[PDB]
Design a protein around this ligand. Structure first.
Ligand code: CAP
Ligand code: CAP
Ligand code: MG
Ligand code: MG
Ligand code: MG
Lengths: 455, 457, 160
């Protein structure tokens, strides 16, 4: 049944909808399935299933309901483009504090409409949130500044935070785990649990946290420098997350503010992210996005993009989120992904379709990870334009021929090489650890630098 | 770099892995991306990124780590098949009660491996959980039995629960909302919040809960029959969910056991499902899967299938989950989806690759929804084989020409027609509400029944 | 929770899983933490199930947490020795609702991966239904073991 006359108003202007500040805008790449309605008809049903309607008319509908209908206000069949305007009154609010929830946003904009039989596929590429709705989100409470302050760095442009992931992903018992932490910290700043590390039977949570706490104290006493750790506290059970978080902070004691909390936000869900954000607002919230690739991949024409996921995470209150290597690492990513970083860091930025004013909402740090090492870093920073971020290199550090500590220093020197604007191969002649990264990863060295070995 | 020698052991036999009861098995349909390694090489890296390794060798690796490596134990490149065995020691456990978490299962089996550059796509179609890992999951604490008991039905095979969704999806104010609830309950049993309904500014949560609570009392007093309602309590904030849930139960008072709690488990995540499951174990947990289509659709070759999503939901403790209309409704689905229903309801069932014993773990109700009406119901039931379930028809009920109450009765009579094995058109001549469903949805009636008008009016 | 859940842990059929061999640690009171745990290990070499005698808890000569830790170790040792699963029923009876939570919560964390091997015993007749309900609602996933000490005062045929 055709509901275009109700759910479609292409005479509406995007500029006025933004100026109004009473609508969330979303931009989709949608394709109707063969044997049903044309583009606007299918788009109309899409809007219905995403706001106020269903697949048939019902007597219970009144004029007030019609007033809050979402509306397709712009379409371009030749590019499969479909823009929809959602009145902000549609989105659910907390009874307890009147604040917004991303779960309601997801349910309407990217929920049931992903299972429509008359649609072949549809994927959100961008969305706009007006001021009245934006200010109702938590936003980040801790930022990279709080990490800079702990490291004794300038709170403004404090610079690059050298990081790694403890590898193997799983298998290290408590003390072997802590030993690797100590080694890396002799040359680096930051360490995160690999995403699945927690309370495995061969590496009990409390024993590992205790061993790492010891390793931090030993490393700090040895180097005279502050060291950071990001603990995975992900769990199905809200109270398990609290239990883990509380034990960590008590255990680390005077080093409690050296701690970040990692949450697998995509698989555990927004509910888990909000648990950490609200229970531990004074601890850096580290959003790990494992599993996101199922929808965000360009290979997928469903769900939403990495850009959308990142923008949402900032609203949820992620202190930092993985944004990818932007084509310079091992995972799917493009140089154009730099736009994602700007969107989560700046107070004003452009998306693929919408300009977003953030109204002083705190930034989310772009966390760079995925097959990175000292050799690949200069190219990466060139594409982004800055190094005010956290970069973790698991294999890149612990895969160094001279050990984790040397690996750490190679990452440090790689960024110093870019900041000096020096040539990597020439730079290497005065920095062994960086030069030794060439021998550690000769295939990367051969591709990135053609004749590094002779020179 | 090639890691086949470490992460691949094709000499392992599946029967031994199952008999051992120390491995979670997963079956994927994977395709390597062009310009990298062959199938087994790509499969090896996939396993590494899904268990103990990364894209390069590291000095920190010891033999104990190698002892817990996941392993590719079966492949079929001509069919793009890849089976992986995960040692159960890899999966995270709660510090507080030593129980399992689905979040850890997802992180390893379907996490980082979905973003691999050397893989074009990979999708989980089935998984096996041994007893030692299975018993560590919550499982459902409430089942349809408890809804049957309230309705005064037999607790075993209590039969069909006539349901609907309040439509419009959003827009009804508290009392107009409650009025629609009263109308439907005159002929039906069950009503659920549409998935986004909650605390909208035009329909305050507490005002609506109070209005619906009043409507239930009026409808039950009117019909002398018990009536059920499923409230959406989804929220980012764990404490918001508790606040909503606690207010509902107190408000309904002596009808508190008539209440189910709906959670948008896919978009809100397992954390939200577990909050409801553990805070309110005595209330029927209604898992709404909105958004699942992004990965479960056959159009997608990433993530996991609807079968996997449903199987996980049983472990998480869903009292019921939407399983789709199996090709008979408005959403993407196939007739073969009946197998999903069997997997979540039976104590033993076969998946696309693995046989699963549930060891007495409680069943999860298949909740049928999505463009269903009285006309489409007989066909759906024929494919499934039973009607011991909940079916909700929003448009099918409130889209009835004679109103929501008539709509309810049409759904009731439609199911009565299938169990009696009667001819729908002939059945209609003695059942008005069912007959009026033809005139309500003539397009469906014309295709499903060719000359109903001649046989009726 | 039912016997089905105990059968599942023991690796028995969940339907008609059969006889669960059990005992009570004797002396009723007097055993210090390690001698207590030693008796647990001994019995578990041939049996499945062990319950605290009804008054055993936090006596000054057998601190609760010290004993819980010792039994947990004994369970691991017994299970490693026999390759068989072992069950224990801890008395968590108390006047104070929050004491019951404290005992139960400490036990489950301590036993960790063996947490589902634990049953909770409550002296339901003398402590009352309130204590039974505390355990039932706080720990629905743990086998609730109702001990009826004192019941004889009214239930005895001698009493009318
Ligand atoms: O498990 C891993 O692979 C990593 O620890 C990187 O390890 P390596 O440094 O050894 O590659 C990260 O979790 C991924 O980068 C996540 O991907 P993303 O940031 O794109 O979400
Ligand atoms: O919002 C809706 O469209 C529904 O209320 C159906 O309404 P109608 O009865 O009016 O069609 C259900 O939430 C969908 O069935 C969900 O799909 P699924 O069950 O496949 O997850
Ligand atoms: Mg990782
Ligand atoms: Mg719905
Ligand atoms: Mg006794």
């Amino acid at each position: 049944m055709d509901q275009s006359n109700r759910y479609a108003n292409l005479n509406l202007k995007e500029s006025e909808l933004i100026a109004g500040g009473r609508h969330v805008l979303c931009a989709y790449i949608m394709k109707p399935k063969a044997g049903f309605g044309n583009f606007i008809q299918t788009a109309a049903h899409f809007v219905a299933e995403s706001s106020t309607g269903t697949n048939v008319e019902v007597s219970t509908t009144d004029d007030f309901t019609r007033g809050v209908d979402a509306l397709v206000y712009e379409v371009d069949e030749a590019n499969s483009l479909m823009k929809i305007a959602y009145p902000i009154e549609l989105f659910d609010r907390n009874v307890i504090d009147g604040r917004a929830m991303i779960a309601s946003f997801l349910t309407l904009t990217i929920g049931n409409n992903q299972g429509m039989g008359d649609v072949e596929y549809a994927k959100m590429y961008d969305f706009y949130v007006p001021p009245a709705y934006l200010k109702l989100f938590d936003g980040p409470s801790t930022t990279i500044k709080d990490l800079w302050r702990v490291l004794g760095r300038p709170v403004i442009n404090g610079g690059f935070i050298v990081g790694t992931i403890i590898k193997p992903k799983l298998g290290l018992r408590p003390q072997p785990f802590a030993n690797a932490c100590y080694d890396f910290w002799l040359g680096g700043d930051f360490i995160k649990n690999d995403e699945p590390q927690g309370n495995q039977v061969f590496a009990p949570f409390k024993d590992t946290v205790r061993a790492v706490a010891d390793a931090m104290r030993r490393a700090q006493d040895k180097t005279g420098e502050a060291k950071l750790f990001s603990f995975n506290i992900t769990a199905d059970d809200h109270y398990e997350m609290l239990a883990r978080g509380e034990f960590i902070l008590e255990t680390f004691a005077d080093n409690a503010d050296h701690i970040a909390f990692l949450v697998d936000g995509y698989v555990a869900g927004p509910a888990a992210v909000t648990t950490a954000r609200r229970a531990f607002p004074k601890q850096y919230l580290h959003y790990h996005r494992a599993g996101h690739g199922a929808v965000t991949s360009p290979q997928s024409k469903r769900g939403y993009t990495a850009f959308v996921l990142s923008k949402m995470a900032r609203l949820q209150g992620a202190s930092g989120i993985h944004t990818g290597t932007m084509g310079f690492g091992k995972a799917e990513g493009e140089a154009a992904d730099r736009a994602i970083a700007y969107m989560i860091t700046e107070d004003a930025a452009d998306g693929p379709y919408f300009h977003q004013e953030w109204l002083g909402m705190n930034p989310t740090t772009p966390i760079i990870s995925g097959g990175m090492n000292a050799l690949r870093m200069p190219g990466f920073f060139d594409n982004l334009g800055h190094s005010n971020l956290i970069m973790t290199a698991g294999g890149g550090a612990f895969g160094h021929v001279d050990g984790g500590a040397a690996g750490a220093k190679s990452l440090r020197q790689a960024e110093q090489c870019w900041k000096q604007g020096a040539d990597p191969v020439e730079f290497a002649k005065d920095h062994r650890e960086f030069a030794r990264a060439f021998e550690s990863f000769p295939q990367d060295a051969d591709k990135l630098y053609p004749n590094w070995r002779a020179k």
